[PDB]
Design an enzyme around this catalytic site. Structure first.
Site, PDB file in Angstrom:
ATOM      1  N   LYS A   1     -14.458   8.843  -3.893  1.00 13.73           N
ATOM      2  CA  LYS A   1     -15.708   9.033  -3.202  1.00 13.73           C
ATOM      3  C   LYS A   1     -16.288  10.478  -3.696  1.00 13.73           C
ATOM      4  O   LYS A   1     -17.409  10.548  -3.961  1.00 13.73           O
ATOM      5  CB  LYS A   1     -15.312   9.297  -1.954  1.00 13.73           C
ATOM      6  CG  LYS A   1     -15.247   7.894  -1.081  1.00 13.73           C
ATOM      7  CD  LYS A   1     -14.628   8.278   0.381  1.00 13.73           C
ATOM      8  CE  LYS A   1     -13.594   7.002   0.638  1.00 13.73           C
ATOM      9  NZ  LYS A   1     -13.261   7.363   2.055  1.00 13.73           N
TER      10      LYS A   1
ATOM     11  N   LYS B   1      -8.566  14.274   4.428  1.00  8.78           N
ATOM     12  CA  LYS B   1      -7.870  13.090   4.551  1.00  8.78           C
ATOM     13  C   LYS B   1      -6.726  13.140   5.658  1.00  8.78           C
ATOM     14  O   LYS B   1      -6.603  14.303   6.195  1.00  8.78           O
ATOM     15  CB  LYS B   1      -6.870  12.740   3.398  1.00  8.78           C
ATOM     16  CG  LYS B   1      -5.861  13.811   2.984  1.00  8.78           C
ATOM     17  CD  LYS B   1      -6.036  14.633   1.718  1.00  8.78           C
ATOM     18  CE  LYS B   1      -5.633  13.946   0.240  1.00  8.78           C
ATOM     19  NZ  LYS B   1      -6.884  13.280  -0.062  1.00  8.78           N
ATOM     20  N   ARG B   2      -6.119  12.051   5.999  1.00  9.66           N
ATOM     21  CA  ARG B   2      -5.104  12.216   7.039  1.00  9.66           C
ATOM     22  C   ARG B   2      -3.966  13.391   6.725  1.00  9.66           C
ATOM     23  O   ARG B   2      -3.838  13.519   5.642  1.00  9.66           O
ATOM     24  CB  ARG B   2      -4.263  10.996   7.440  1.00  9.66           C
ATOM     25  CG  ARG B   2      -5.226   9.859   8.118  1.00  9.66           C
ATOM     26  CD  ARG B   2      -5.641  10.221   9.391  1.00  9.66           C
ATOM     27  NE  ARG B   2      -4.516  10.627  10.626  1.00  9.66           N
ATOM     28  CZ  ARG B   2      -4.243   9.409  11.066  1.00  9.66           C
ATOM     29  NH1 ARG B   2      -4.695   8.257  11.287  1.00  9.66           N
ATOM     30  NH2 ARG B   2      -3.003   9.473  12.066  1.00  9.66           N
TER      31      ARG B   2
ATOM     32  N   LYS C   1       0.584  14.524   1.508  1.00  8.20           N
ATOM     33  CA  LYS C   1      -0.521  14.914   1.058  1.00  8.20           C
ATOM     34  C   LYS C   1      -0.631  16.279   0.681  1.00  8.20           C
ATOM     35  O   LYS C   1      -1.548  16.752  -0.054  1.00  8.20           O
ATOM     36  CB  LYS C   1      -1.797  14.512   2.157  1.00  8.20           C
ATOM     37  CG  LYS C   1      -1.514  13.160   2.662  1.00  8.20           C
ATOM     38  CD  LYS C   1      -2.608  12.175   1.923  1.00  8.20           C
ATOM     39  CE  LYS C   1      -2.798  11.087   3.068  1.00  8.20           C
ATOM     40  NZ  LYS C   1      -3.333   9.704   2.220  1.00  8.20           N
TER      41      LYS C   1
ATOM     42  N   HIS D   1       0.801  -1.234  -0.058  1.00  6.11           N
ATOM     43  CA  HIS D   1      -0.160   0.030  -0.020  1.00  6.11           C
ATOM     44  C   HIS D   1       0.642   1.259  -0.005  1.00  6.11           C
ATOM     45  O   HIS D   1      -0.053   2.187  -0.101  1.00  6.11           O
ATOM     46  CB  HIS D   1      -1.023   0.173   1.125  1.00  6.11           C
ATOM     47  CG  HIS D   1      -2.121  -1.171   0.989  1.00  6.11           C
ATOM     48  ND1 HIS D   1      -3.214  -0.952   0.591  1.00  6.11           N
ATOM     49  CD2 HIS D   1      -1.918  -2.364   1.859  1.00  6.11           C
ATOM     50  CE1 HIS D   1      -3.841  -2.026   0.879  1.00  6.11           C
ATOM     51  NE2 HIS D   1      -3.217  -3.010   1.625  1.00  6.11           N
TER      52      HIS D   1
ATOM     53  N   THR E   1      -8.595   6.849  -2.168  1.00  2.61           N
ATOM     54  CA  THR E   1      -9.867   6.293  -2.342  1.00  2.61           C
ATOM     55  C   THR E   1     -10.916   7.503  -2.235  1.00  2.61           C
ATOM     56  O   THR E   1     -12.047   7.487  -2.601  1.00  2.61           O
ATOM     57  CB  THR E   1     -10.328   5.196  -1.324  1.00  2.61           C
ATOM     58  OG1 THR E   1      -9.789   5.410  -0.010  1.00  2.61           O
ATOM     59  CG2 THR E   1      -9.594   3.755  -2.003  1.00  2.61           C
TER      60      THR E   1
HETATM   61  C1  LIG Z   1      -2.365   4.441   5.473  1.00  2.00           C
HETATM   62  N1  LIG Z   1      -2.256   4.068   4.263  1.00  2.00           N
HETATM   63  C2  LIG Z   1      -1.412   3.402   3.536  1.00  2.00           C
HETATM   64  O1  LIG Z   1      -0.182   2.808   4.110  1.00  2.00           O
HETATM   65  N2  LIG Z   1      -1.432   3.126   2.424  1.00  2.00           N
HETATM   66  C3  LIG Z   1      -2.733   3.439   1.960  1.00  2.00           C
HETATM   67  O2  LIG Z   1      -3.725   2.596   1.316  1.00  2.00           O
HETATM   68  C4  LIG Z   1      -5.013   3.223   0.636  1.00  2.00           C
HETATM   69  C5  LIG Z   1      -5.577   1.948   0.181  1.00  2.00           C
HETATM   70  O3  LIG Z   1      -4.586   1.237  -0.487  1.00  2.00           O
HETATM   71  C6  LIG Z   1      -4.681   4.102  -0.362  1.00  2.00           C
HETATM   72  O4  LIG Z   1      -5.546   4.469  -1.206  1.00  2.00           O
HETATM   73  C7  LIG Z   1      -3.668   5.204  -0.086  1.00  2.00           C
HETATM   74  O5  LIG Z   1      -3.244   5.813  -1.226  1.00  2.00           O
HETATM   75  C8  LIG Z   1      -2.401   4.553   0.706  1.00  2.00           C
HETATM   76  O6  LIG Z   1      -1.719   5.857   1.072  1.00  2.00           O
HETATM   77  C9  LIG Z   1      -3.182   4.286   3.349  1.00  2.00           C
HETATM   78  O7  LIG Z   1      -3.972   5.004   3.479  1.00  2.00           O
HETATM   79  C1  LIG Z   2     -11.929   7.473   2.246  1.00  2.00           C
HETATM   80  C2  LIG Z   2     -11.260   7.680   3.697  1.00  2.00           C
HETATM   81  C3  LIG Z   2      -9.942   7.907   3.759  1.00  2.00           C
HETATM   82  C4  LIG Z   2      -9.040   7.879   2.513  1.00  2.00           C
HETATM   83  O1  LIG Z   2      -8.829   9.137   2.024  1.00  2.00           O
HETATM   84  P1  LIG Z   2      -7.716   9.393   1.050  1.00  2.00           P
HETATM   85  O2  LIG Z   2      -7.848  10.805   0.675  1.00  2.00           O
HETATM   86  O3  LIG Z   2      -7.494   8.190   0.264  1.00  2.00           O
HETATM   87  O4  LIG Z   2      -6.172   9.554   1.977  1.00  2.00           O
HETATM   88  C5  LIG Z   2      -9.458   8.500   4.941  1.00  2.00           C
HETATM   89  N1  LIG Z   2     -10.320   8.671   6.038  1.00  2.00           N
HETATM   90  C6  LIG Z   2     -11.768   8.487   5.825  1.00  2.00           C
HETATM   91  C7  LIG Z   2     -12.402   8.712   7.133  1.00  2.00           C
HETATM   92  C8  LIG Z   2     -12.166   7.982   4.697  1.00  2.00           C
HETATM   93  O5  LIG Z   2     -13.696   7.874   4.460  1.00  2.00           O
END
Ligand SMILES: CN1C(=O)N[C@@]2(O[C@H](CO)[C@@H](O)[C@H](O)[C@H]2O)C1=O
Ligand SMILES: *Cc1c(COP(=O)(O)O)cnc(C)c1O
Ligand SMILES: CN1C(=O)N[C@@]2(O[C@H](CO)[C@@H](O)[C@H](O)[C@H]2O)C1=O
Ligand SMILES: *Cc1c(COP(=O)(O)O)cnc(C)c1O
Lengths: 830, 830
Positions: free
Chosen positions: A668, A556-557, A562, A365, A664
């Protein structure tokens, strides 16, 4: 009311009396003292009743037919609330809405009372949740396996502009969805030592911790399939954790049980960052050890625990079992599977290895180095002595394979080793996973290519067949039907309902791109969504926004990769331009930035303070008026995501090209009518490819440009020297324009930006604001903005997790998805 | 089948479908995978359903009518299993028996699966349980308040003849009877300091622990009244227990929550012994602080929280509230009630004191010094600073009262002080209770007199009106109807069923003392009982006994004052006589000794080892044959008591005259057809008085003789010198006759017996075995033995807790008991 199902005469009546049964018999309350929380539980229990029947027949079914089983191991499962989702998958939403209405209650008000199942950090945890929903919807005999943390991701509080963390006691009032299964408790071993006697090694003198399972139902979408998510809880044995005698204190011995039980007490709040703590490693072996025993027990029964060839032949193990490793967290499953097969079942090494490799698959990931799991050998040595021995042996044989394939390539050998030498010896968990799995996959096309070209190049040259790709997706149920019924309804009015489990059908919406009524409707729901969110804001958090402005959101985090900071630079730029020419017209914007920062990530917490600092200045400048607002969305989580995303106009996916594996959130936003401004990173590439680059706002460096710059050497001063607007911002931060009382407050950010920016923020600045101008231009033309939106929505079908899962199923697990309705839920009592 | 109620046609059918509903919907199981444990829960849930309706109307009732409320504070509630008891009080036993039979299950087998609610140590904890049952049966608006320990009294294991303690995880599989009430959580403070500002003192900078309540229903006997037992659980706040910032670790902060929650983790396993540990003191303030807030809240509503004089006048507080202190454990209720009234409600000291004294009452349970609670001032000083100040002030004013009553009596002043000077200053909790209560009572007539003549003499001279007596009793429901249906049936055949809630009616059995059929029946049930126990023994513990022998049993906690050792001396004597004249006839006996020893009580654990040691020798001597068996009953607890007592022939109540406050086990044996051999101690005096000394086997010193001996000086050597049989035993113990491998194993026991016997075992030896000979003589005459039994049973009526409670109600609480059936359980939903 919408297609939230039928509000049948017999069923609304049935629902109502069952709501009453539970309020009385289960909650032990009477209408005169019941509170909204009580009403929420009565409903929850009433809804849960409808799926136990199906839950039991689904599980019984798999036992009779005995198909190949899919085991999704993950240390994270970001579930969120489950009441509405259950109503949606069971076609119960309208019936419940009616019945509660007749009982004089507002269902929506009750839904807000349900606590989020925050057993995840972000993307990785949520992916797991969407997968579970998809696997159930595709009729796969799949099981989610993880840990039941009693404390999920912390609840974020902003105090004086700073993040404050506070425990997430999500179980405080109870969880009506889970079913404790104490009768299936299993023992897990730690420490001890290895004895080599006559016929095999023995793991001896270990400390035992018990794993108690808790099952949570996972209903497919309207197909009567209800799969299981089994979460393990740590429990201390009542013997040794008391019985290891000879003074200490009886009281103390009992109080010390909360030492073995700490294993499942809290989730580590790290997103894309590795922390080598012992407690984490314990959590990792705990979920693996317990899960594997459960997997083998089920296999021993199957149809082999009756007859078949007769002789526990594990040769069919891979034909009946498939375990997916969500990242390297459950990587110990590999040496553990070997340990059991070799040490306990007594299979020869080679036969055991063949079985292991054939049943295991690994999903990667991220490519950032600080996120990679490299466990110090002295830790594994103390805590899991036999597993270390097994790992060394796996390494030994693997490297011999390499030597034989690349004779004389001595550097390749050290590079590929599972063991890393140096300061302290470490074990590269990722190398372990590649070696013991028959498939390794990335989460987006470019990410997957990067693995092959870079990080795992040597491994790819050795076994090119193992490497694949499986672009991430999201569930259209929660991320469309659930959070945006308005949009789902108007889509259904034109093309029907079959798209909810066949998102590709959204393409048919392309033919309504010039439809006057549709454009007006698409635009209407988005306006309604924005009004509802603007209201929620004042309701729960308090201090106004303007629903007519462009909703610019990045949620996002918080991470340096980011680039929330790049977003910050733009916001300040907008501010400075307005202050320069006050009476010039500009498209109004409400920029919303939300996300959690890991407790120990100093920079991340500094960025949160910056965002609130900018808002303090911008939101109180009279000259700005309502043209620009900067809001930090507090405690961003799944349930909050279901509110903002549907109300967003602009989605910010601006990570440095090559750092975001997939993402992801971006998906959304695309399926919910927001336009995307971002870089050619992760799945953004496939999204722009699907909708057409003309319908996307792409900017900045591509991966190639990033590398060119690195060869050259990145010097931020250059950008500071040639862009006056950029210079002006940096000097504003440096002088305390945004922090009067503490003028040097943001010295770390500036220092970093100028001297150690690993994510070259400045390099994409110019192209970013230039591009931001183009979206403002298009927003001024409502009709064309909405038409571009329709082009995105109609083309997001590829990003449904059903597609992703169908691919995993066929190309990795070797099973065939099925949209066949399981034979009703109908009573039955054999 | 018996008078376990009616097995109605409509109700057995109704029960069956509800059993099925729960097995499916609540347990989420199907008949094909259900285990006895699952079946037990389905039933439990089905039975629990029947009393929620009544539970709700009972509580609503008290709210409407608003009667004086009785609050029974106790740190112990020895409940035991609750399934059968609930069936018995709801007249559901036969219906459930039938229905489960028709479902193809054995109810008795399912009942054995229920874990004991071991939240008590022995007598004190069980008294509380019997009281609760009686208060419900007498229609009193009473509430039991205590702590919900997650670990009750340890489960005892005998390893190599030694006691082994192991955690009692009674909640492992869940508790279907309790109802968590998180919405009524209250805050409790610890530590901090006292600020004296302008208008009053302030308790400041305290550490907050939350108290979450759990309600358990307490059904009266067939009167539709269901009272409540509220047990508090400790929970950490999610703020400060995380929010007190500036480095430490986020993970560590969350793991450290299990520091505030340790307060309710385990019960202290001390019976009649005081341990001044901080954790205990915390448990004591915790239950008091939480309970009092609940009490005042209810009062604020009443009919004052509507109108009345209008002005929170606490003058009626005593008219609406009564709090009973079960021993000194909840003694902090006194200074805490003052703290709230004075500090928070702002009443003047004198008005507050008047209210406090008028609502509080104290019950004393022992006269031994080591059992007395004397808390070091430095502990109270640190943990509860304001309460210490209040106590000093209470002391100040009290002593002034004394000085004024006994001018110049300077020694009296120091003797009566609540503060004890010396090594370390301590607070005499008992003195606190006497001063702040309007009534102080003993638990048996002689015990009460002893308090007045000895321990609390000075306090009695000051306020003679405060001192009363309330002889203990036991509930005829659990201790007769439940554990001995056979005996209850034959009694009912002759005199009816009204005696279950009117035990005095047993006297009518006197007229059947010469009835041939009755004598035969009484004798028959006892034989059936003995056969069932002799079977259970081999079933669950394994190694035969003879059902024809005399069942000689002594079951109670192991203590030096209970004199299990004296019982031991007799057993060895019997053995030695047999070995002397092998071919002489002697009445066969199975002597069963059971009880738990506190973990730190060395002597007590030595005695357990002695008992098993004697059995090792005696049980394997071929010359003895089946004439004498020595068995140690493992893990003696309520549920085990319900099995042995009904099967006992001889009850051993041989404590040193003046040490056993009352005892209740003795009563349990008397009502179940066993004859009593004992000393004129505790309630034994009132029992012999009620049945006639001719129908009792009384022996040994009276209290007077004990004191005469103490004046003289107790010298055990004298007895050793004049009794050869006694000498022979001591030299057997001394030489290793009973411990071959470790000859000096019992040196501590011998040493103690000869030099520091605080309970003069030797002094009662001669009269004890002489008396034992008389019971053997009478056992040889079955007809006369049974007739004496009938004289005991028919005369045990006075020892029912209904009598005790009726007296507390009238002479202390100021309320009138009522045997009026509450208006049915009938549905209703307002
Ligand atoms: C924390 N974290 C990761 O270490 N990898 C993550 O996994 C997600 C699902 O595979 C990906 O969409 C993110 O881009 C990736 O940062 C993510 O959210
Ligand atoms: C979908 C989701 C994420 C992932 O967001 P990214 O923009 O891919 O980092 C993180 N937190 C919540 C609460 C989500 O619904
Ligand atoms: C432990 N413990 C005591 O401290 N006092 C006890 O209380 C019981 C009920 O009042 C009495 O029957 C016992 O005689 C007394 O020892 C008891 O069992
Ligand atoms: C009744 C009871 C007691 C009290 O016994 P005594 O002989 O008064 O010390 C102790 N334990 C249990 C389990 C009881 O049922």
């Amino acid at each position: 009311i919408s297609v939230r199902g039928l509000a049948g005469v017999e069923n609304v009546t049935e629902l109502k009396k069952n709501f009453n049964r539970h309020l009385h018999f289960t909650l032990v309350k009477d209408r005169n003292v019941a509170t909204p929380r009580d009403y929420y539980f009565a409903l929850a229990h009433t809804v849960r009743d409808h799926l136990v029947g199906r839950w039991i027949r689904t599980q019984q079914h798999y036992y009779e037919k005995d198909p190949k089983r899919i085991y999704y191991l993950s240390l994270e499962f970001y579930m969120g609330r489950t009441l509405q989702n259950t109503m949606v998958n069971l076609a119960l939403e309208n019936a419940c809405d009616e019945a509660t209405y007749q009982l004089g209650l507002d269902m929506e008000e009750l839904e807000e009372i349900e606590e989020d199942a925050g057993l995840g950090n972000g993307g990785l945890g949520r992916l797991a949740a969407c997968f579970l929903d998809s696997m159930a919807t595709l009729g796969l005999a799949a099981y989610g396996y993880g840990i039941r943390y009693e404390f999920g991701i912390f609840n974020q509080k902003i105090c004086g502009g700073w993040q404050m963390e506070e425990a997430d006691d999500w179980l405080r009032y109870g969880n009506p969805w889970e079913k404790a299964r104490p009768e299936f408790t299993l023992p897990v071993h730690f420490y001890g030592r290895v004895e080599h006697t006559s016929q095999g090694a023995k793991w001896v003198d270990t400390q035992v911790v018990l794993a108690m399972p808790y099952d949570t139902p996972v209903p497919g979408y309207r197909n009567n399939v209800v799969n299981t998510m089994r979460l393990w809880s740590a429990k201390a044995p009542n013997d040794f954790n008391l019985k290891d005698f000879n003074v200490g204190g009886y009281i103390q011995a009992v109080l010390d049980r909360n030492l073995a039980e700490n294993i499942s007490r809290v989730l580590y709040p790290n997103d894309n960052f590795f922390e080598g703590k012992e407690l984490r490693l314990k959590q990792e072996y705990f979920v693996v050890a317990a899960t594997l025993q459960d997997i083998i027990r089920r296999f021993k029964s199957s149809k082999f625990g009756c007859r078949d060839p007769v002789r526990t032949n594990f040769d069919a193990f891979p034909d009946k079992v498939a375990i997916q490793l969500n990242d390297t967290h459950p990587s110990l499953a590999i040496p553990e599977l070997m340990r059991v097969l070799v040490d306990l079942e007594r299979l020869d090494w080679d036969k055991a290895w063949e079985v292991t490799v054939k049943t295991c698959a690994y999903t990667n990931h991220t490519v950032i180095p600080e996120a990679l799991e490299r466990w110090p050998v002295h830790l594994l040595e103390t805590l899991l002595p036999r597993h270390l021995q097994i790992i060394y042996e796996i390494n030994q044989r693997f490297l011999n394979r390499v030597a034989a394939a690349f004779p004389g390539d001595v550097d390749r050998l050290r590079r590929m080793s599972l063991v890393e030498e140096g300061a302290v010896k470490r074990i590269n968990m990722a190398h372990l996973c590649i070696a013991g799995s028959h498939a390794v996959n990335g989460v987006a096309r470019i990410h997957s290519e990067i693995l092959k070209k870079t990080i795992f190049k040597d491994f790819y040259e050795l076994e090119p067949h193992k490497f694949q790709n499986k672009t991430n997706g999201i569930t259209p149920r929660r991320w469309l039907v659930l959070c945006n019924p308005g949009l789902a309804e108007i889509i259904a009015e034109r093309i029907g309902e079959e798209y909810i489990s066949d998102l590709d059908q959204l393409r048919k919406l392309l033919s309504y791109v010039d439809d006057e009524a549709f454009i007006r409707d698409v635009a209407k729901v988005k306006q309604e969504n924005k009004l509802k969110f603007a209201a929620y804001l004042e309701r729960e958090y308090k201090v106004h926004i303007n629903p007519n402005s462009l909703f610019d959101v990045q949620v996002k985090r918080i991470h340096e990769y980011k680039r929330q900071l790049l977003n910050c630079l733009h916001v300040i730029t907008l501010y400075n331009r307005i202050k320069k020419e006050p009476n010039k017209f500009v498209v109004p914007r409400t920029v919303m930035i939300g996300g959690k920062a890991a407790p120990g990530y100093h920079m991340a917490k500094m960025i949160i303070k910056l965002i609130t600092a900018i808002g303090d200045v911008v939101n109180h400048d009279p000259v700005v008026g309502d043209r620009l607002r900067v809001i930090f969305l507090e405690n961003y989580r799944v349930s909050l995501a279901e509110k903002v995303i549907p109300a967003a106009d602009l989605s910010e996916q601006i990570s440095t090209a090559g750092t975001e594996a997939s993402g992801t959130g971006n998906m959304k936003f695309m399926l919910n009518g927001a336009l995307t401004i971002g870089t050619m990173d992760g799945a953004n590439v496939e999204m722009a490819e699907e909708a057409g680059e003309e319908n996307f706002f792409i900017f900045g460096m591509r991966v190639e440009d990033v590398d060119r710059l690195d060869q050259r050497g990145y010097n931020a001063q250059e950008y500071y020297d040639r862009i006056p607007e950029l210079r002006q911002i940096i000097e504003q931060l440096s002088s305390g324009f945004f922090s009067p009382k503490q003028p040097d407050l943001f010295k770390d950010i500036v220092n970093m930006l100028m001297h150690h920016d690993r994510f070259k923020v400045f390099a994409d600045y110019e192209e970013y604001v230039k591009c931001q101008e183009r979206v403002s231009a298009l927003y001024k033309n409502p009709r064309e903005w909405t038409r571009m939106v329709i082009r995105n929505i109609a083309t997001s079908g590829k990003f449904s997790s059903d597609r992703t899962i169908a691919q995993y199923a066929r190309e990795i697990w070797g099973v065939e998805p099925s949209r066949q309705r399981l034979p009703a839920p109908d009573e039955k009592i054999p």
